[PDB]
Structure formats: structure tokens, C-alpha cells
Design a binder for these strands. Sequence first.
DNA 1: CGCGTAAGCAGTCCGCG
DNA 2: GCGGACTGCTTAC
Length: 901
Amino acid sequence: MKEFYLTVEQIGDSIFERYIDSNGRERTREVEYKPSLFAHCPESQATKYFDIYGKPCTRKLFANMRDASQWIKRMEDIGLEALGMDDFKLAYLSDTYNYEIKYDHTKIRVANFDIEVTSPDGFPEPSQAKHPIDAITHYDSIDDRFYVFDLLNSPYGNVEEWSIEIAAKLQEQGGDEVPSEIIDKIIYMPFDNEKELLMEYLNFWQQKTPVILTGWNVESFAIPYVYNRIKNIFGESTAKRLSPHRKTRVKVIENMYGSREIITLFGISVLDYIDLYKKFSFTNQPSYSLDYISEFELNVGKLKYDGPISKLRESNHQRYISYNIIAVYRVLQIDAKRQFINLSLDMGYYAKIQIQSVFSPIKTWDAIIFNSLKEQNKVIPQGRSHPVQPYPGAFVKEPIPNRYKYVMSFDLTSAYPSIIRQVNISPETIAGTFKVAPLHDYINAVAERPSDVYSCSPNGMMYYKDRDGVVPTEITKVFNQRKEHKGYMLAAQRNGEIIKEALHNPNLSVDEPLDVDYRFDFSDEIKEKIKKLSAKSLNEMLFRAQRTEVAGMTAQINRKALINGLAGALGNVWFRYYDLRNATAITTFGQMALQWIERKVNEYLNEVCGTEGEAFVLYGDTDSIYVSADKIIDKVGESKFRDTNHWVDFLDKFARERMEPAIDRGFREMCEYMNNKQHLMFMDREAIAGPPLGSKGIGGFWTGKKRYALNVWDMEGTRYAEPKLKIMGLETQKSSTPKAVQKALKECIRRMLQEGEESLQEYFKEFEKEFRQLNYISIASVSSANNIAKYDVGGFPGPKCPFHIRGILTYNRAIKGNIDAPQVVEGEKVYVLPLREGNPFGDKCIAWPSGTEITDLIKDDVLHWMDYTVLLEKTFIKPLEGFTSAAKLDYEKKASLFDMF
DNA sequence: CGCGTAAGCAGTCCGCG
DNA sequence: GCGGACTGCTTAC
Ligand SMILES: Nc1ncnc2c1ncn2[C@H]1C[C@H](O)[C@@H](COP(=O)(O)OP(=O)(O)OP(=O)(O)O)O1
Ligand SMILES: [Ca+2]
Ligand SMILES: [Ca+2]
Ligand SMILES: [Ca+2]
Ligand SMILES: [Ca+2]
Ligand SMILES: [Ca+2]
């Protein structure tokens, strides 16, 4: 097999590399790598090295890496560009792995761990590490084993050994219900003292050194806690044994308000799963506790116990340990679903970077672009300093707030990356400028043609047409991977709908789910067998189909995120190829494209309908259009349709056969107007929306920009067994809206769009009457809490104090003088409830850490003083009033002359 | 900590005769 | 009350 790196580090004048050798064995080496950098040279000087603009360069080979770094600094002192990859480990990987890397994940040691620390005096600060580590569970991917290190004797209690037999029993047998599928994979190690536990942990760590190190909050808590605890007990050199090169660094993580400390372990790639989830899941969660995220992702019940965690070990060590093991398994379960580890390895090896660098789109693109250019003996420019400057982005159309009955939507495939490829936007393809006319003049095709030579953007930029730039070339490669995975995702989604259909008529039989590849549309034979299956088998297939779809979604959406990130990187001052001319070339072309195609679709439909000046495009945002299809439907007349699916086919057919060719012609003209290199504006049909045939449903509504709802029957070729709501921006979609309020508002919208005004009025009356019985957590608002200190004036609200911050200060006063009972963490999320006039808390709201029950000290007082009236007006009635006025409906029945009999 | 901009709504402070 | 100036937060793309 071809070799591949696991980790790489620069330590002084040495490169330290852990790798898999040609025999699939893990090895480590230290290599005194001599880097090269570059300077411009005269043309009379013969070379094979050229900068990206075609100017000749001489290669400078250094005795060592520090020499190279010193040269860079001197070049700055002289005032001359020092060209080349200045991140030497990236150059080392490029020289050592000069081919497309094939990696074998089964050879990569992936460690998932969690620690427990009993603390009576509040949260155990990792930088202090003053309390004993009393449990460690460490899963090894190569062994497939959970290693449990259990402290029996502590200053906070001496306990009995954990029992695997009790751990396996049902909660209803007094057990811990540790999943039977991991019972035989647990390797249990009790210890009489903490010193021997840690000493044994480090020895195990040497034998089985993690390559990829993950778990939940391991980077901010577990890793620094273990390092600092070992440091405090044994000294620094022993703590540095967590790094296979015995090198570590305290890294200061700064943000807008304050900073925090992490421990960089050289030769380890830390991928904290919380950070993988936030980056790759495309959710925004009210809480990031592992129990909350596990509930969300896996529908597993919260890990339940009596008393605080600080008393759990001494009161129920059996459960304490089982829940530590379960915590580790839960992260593994989430990853089997979301596959964020697999994703990170794919992208990291593709770019030829340190795996943990997948967190940085700038670092990822820098390496992809460097490896690409290096292949043609081209030489990358020096990174430079730039002041942060604002620049313009997308166009969004102001919609007329209304109901809209029948709607069809269209948007560009991979908009910004497609703009890059079409126009040929790249640092090295800039050809010059042309004199710009107002954007309006290009939209309406009255402005002079920009160039008869070069490919243009309405921002004034011109680009070469003889050859692809490196940005277009490389963005195309990831785009293509993206397309493949999106293909698998959509097929699994369509397959899911077939299974849902079949479930209306399940057979009374005993059988198995079919062995199938859900990434590919079901053949007729499979469809035939499916209609003969039991409910049990069908459901399992549905679960498997939806897992495949999730796998497809992870692979495609994060590849889209990377290529969209290159467009954004052009407007980030730290990017090597930062250029506001290119960043604005993309966004400004996007503005034209949308408004151009809006004009064209309007013109085409006015012609089709024999009218003039009517707006068929009601809305659009960035790269998308929403077309009113009332007139298309009315031209055949609703009476002609058999059922809803009939008009859906008709609109589907109209979009494919009439709209899209019209749209394509409009864009091909635009491409020639701009003299672009290649036509790549592909605006495919997204949604087909309307009320159920025969109903009083309103179909859809818009309240303003980025705020709308549609009753969708077909989405990108997926025909749903049941209509699905596409809701954007409205309160049902915000993590700040109470859980139960999101649900009630969604149902109000369902009824508006599918059933009509009277159905909505019936539901509202019921919700208003019953909502006071909702559990307080379900009706609490949610907000991030930044700058709690800035607004704290002797424990009271200072000027301009945010409402959610006021709640926190109220909480702080009410718990003051409690070393136990949870503190609100700066920068994390809180639940917020209003309080009625004249409460014991002395203020109008209270906030507490999100994902948690409010501490029992004040819970009963909070519940008694919760302002249900304010809560209902603010989170439910006010948004609903917004929805219904836009849609020209009333959520309460008005008086009529019929009320007279 | 980690690519970009546009733009919505909650809330505070305060004007508005 | 409601809106504009402003801060804070969150979402659409
Ligand atoms: N998260 C983001 N980061 C940066 N730019 C974005 C992001 N989301 C959207 N954009 C910009 C770039 C996109 O190409 C453009 C259109 O957005 P959108 O339609 O959501 O994605 P897309 O057109 O790239 O892919 P798709 O083919 O799935 O429509 O808006
Ligand atoms: Ca724990
Ligand atoms: Ca798009
Ligand atoms: Ca059947
Ligand atoms: Ca879009
Ligand atoms: Ca599409």
C-alpha cells in the first residue's frame, strides 16, 4: 500500500512525523527537512520556477527551517517579497506525499475519551486542576474497546468496584442499561489511588497513542484537566508524555470578550466533537450538553440520576461509572450517524494538511492551492497585511407581504463557485478593468458590452480566457465531489419516500429488510418486494434509508461549505489570495444574475399569459427566484385536476419543459453579454408549492425578506408521500423561540397553508386556553449570553442592559453565596423567563443555564412567579399576528351578522 | 478560534408638542 | 405607543 501521514509537527529544525508505512504499520520519524523559499530574479537568469503572474524566481535552499524563517524576516526588513510556502510542515507533506493520498481509516488510531472529577466547591477549573480525576473512559478504535480507569479511594470517598452485571440490567431492574452491544467491549480497571491510575493511564497512552483525539468538550475541559492534574502531582515532564514527542504548549484562545487556555499536544490531532458538530451539523442548538445533543440526534432518553453530580460518586458510584462509559459511547453513536470524523479525514488528506486544520477554510484552501501550483513549478506569493474593509454582498428582493397560493422556486446550483468558474475569477487571471455603468444598466442590457476580449463581471473586473485560473480549477474538483454525494443523498431521500408510501399498506408477514444500497434509486424488483414487506421490515429500511441520506448530507453540504468558503476567503484579510476585486467580482455578478433572470422570467411569462408589466417573480434572495404559478394553474382550471399530485406533475412538467429552457436562454445571453469563459449558471427547479386540491389552505405566505412559508409537494425531484412545510426565518426556525412555541406556531402555519382560516382559529383558541400547563422549560426563551460583566453594576443591571443579561443578574443574586448550584458561563446559552410584578427575585426576568433544570433552591419560586401572559404575548401572539396580517387572515373569528339568532 | 454579507426581530433609551 | 439610533442575537443566503 501507498504510505500516508498520520500527524506532522515542526519542532525547531526538525519535522516530526507519525505515519503509516508501506506495510500498514505505524512509525515515527524525525527529519531535518531543508525547506525552499523563493525570490524574484532577473529574466536573464534561467529558471524553471515562476510566480503565479509568470515572473521568474530563483529557489533558495536553506540549511534548516529557522534559517528560512530568519530569511523571511530579513526580506521584510529590506522590503522584498519572500515567496513560497512559509508553513514548512505543509511543504514537507507536499514533498513527502506527492500523489493523491489513499488512506486506510482502520490503521488510524481514533481515541474517544471522557473524564469524571468530583468537586464540592463548584466547577473544576482545568487550569487549577485541584480535585482528583476519579474516572476515565477511553475508547480505542483499533482495539474497539472501552478502557475504564476507576478510582476507588479518594479524599471525597472510598467506594466499591463497579459491577458490569448491574450495569447491563434494565433501569427497571435497578441497572444502568449500558447497551448490550458494548458490554463485552469494556475493559475495567479499578485503582486504589489516583497516582497509580494516572501512571497506568500514561503507560496505556504510550502503548496506544491517539492520532485523532476526540470526545465532548475534550479540548476545553478533559485534555487541559488531565494535563494540569498530572503536572500538579508529578511535574511537567510527566504531563508532556501525553504528546508522543514530549512537546506541549499552552495556547491562548482569544475572542471579542476575554480569552481561554488550551493545551496543544504536539503529534496529536485533537478534533473535539462539540466543535466538529457546530462546524459540520448545520444546526443551532438551544444547548450543547451531550445529553441534549444525544436526545436530538439519537432519540435516547436523558441519563438520569438523583442529587447533584458532586454527590453522585459517593451516593451511587455504580451509576457514576456506567454514565461515564455511556457518555463516551454516545459520541461514537452520533458519529456513526453524522460521520464527521470520516469527513474530516477525507478533507484533511485531500488538502494535505494537519487533520485539525479542517476547522480553517483559509488553511485548507492555502494548502490545496499550494499543492496545485507546486505541480506546475509555480510559486505562491507571500501573505500580506490588509486592513479589514467592508464589501457588498448579495441582492435580496423586497417581497409584497401576502399569501401566495401556487409557487415554483428556482435557484442556481453552487452559485458562487459557479460564478468563479464561469467568469474565471482567480488571483492570476486578472486581465485589467473596464469602465462600469450602474448595475441597473447591465441588468436591463442597455450598458455597453464590457469587453470583446476578456471575461467580465459588472464590478469592473476583466479576466483572461485562454486558460483556467488555479481557483476555478481547484474549486471545480471539490464541486464535482460535492455533486456525487448530493446525488447519493437525494436518491436515499427518494428511496425513503417509496418506503413511506409502502407503509400505508404493510403485509401481515414475517420477513427481513432487503439488503440494498440506498444511495441508488430502487429498481422495479426492489419496489415490488417492498410492497410485500411487513411494517417491521419497512421501518428498519426507512431507518437505514434515512441514515444513508444523513451520510449523503454530511458529505455534500460540507463540501458545498468548503467551496463557498473559498469565495468568502477572497474577502478575509488573512487569506494569501485576499483580494476585494475578486470577492466583489463574485458578489456583484450574483446581483446582476438574479435581477437579470428576474426580468427574463417576467418577460417570458407575460408573453405566455399575453399580458404586460405583471410581476411573476414575487421574491428572490442571492441566487433564487420564486414564481407565482396561479395563472398557469388557472389557464387549465382547477376543475381539470384529478387530485393534488396531478397539478404537481403539471407544474413539474411546466418547470422542466418551458421554464428551465427559457431560464437557460436568458443566462446564455448574459454569459455572452459579459463574454464569460463558460456558461455555468444552472437555475434548476427547487420547490413546487400550493394548497391541497379542494382545500381552503392558503398555500404559502411572505411577511418580509428572509421570512416565508410554503406548502411543498416536490423538492428537487423528491415527491413526498405527505406535504412538507418549507419555513424560512420565521420564529418556528429560531433556536431563541421556546420549544413548545415553535411547535404551536408550526401547527398554526400548517393549518393556514393546508386547511385555512377557520382551522387556524380553532387551534389558536385551544393553545391560548391550555398553554399554562406547558412545562416551564418548553416555554422558556433561549439566548447566548455575552458580556455579563460589562452590564453587572454591583449585581444590578447597568445602562442598556440586555433583557437576557438582566435575567442572569437576577439569577446571580438569587443564588449568591452558593459554591454549589450552577453558574452561568459567559458566552454560553441561557433559558429566560419573565416574572410577574412584585416577585421575590426583585426583577422582571430570570435566566439560567440552558439544557438544565433550574436549581431546586429557586425552582418553586420561579414556577409560581412565571409570567405566562407576557410569555404568550411575546413568543406566540406577536409572531402569529405578524404571520396572519401578512396572509390577510385573522387568528380570532370576527363578529358577523350571523351572531344574531 | 475556525470563510463571506444581508437583514430580520427583541429590547433599551428617548423623542414626539 | 411607535419609530429611529443603537446593541445583541440569530438566520438566509
Ligand atoms: N454558509 C455560507 N457561507 C458563505 N457563503 C454562503 C453560505 N451560504 C450561502 N452562501 C452564498 C454562496 C452560495 O453559493 C450562495 C447561494 O446559496 P445556497 O443556494 O444556499 O448555496 P449554493 O448555491 O452554493 O448550493 P446549492 O447548489 O445547494 O443551491 O450564497
Ligand atoms: Ca460527566
Ligand atoms: Ca443555490
Ligand atoms: Ca404491502
Ligand atoms: Ca438559494
Ligand atoms: Ca438545485
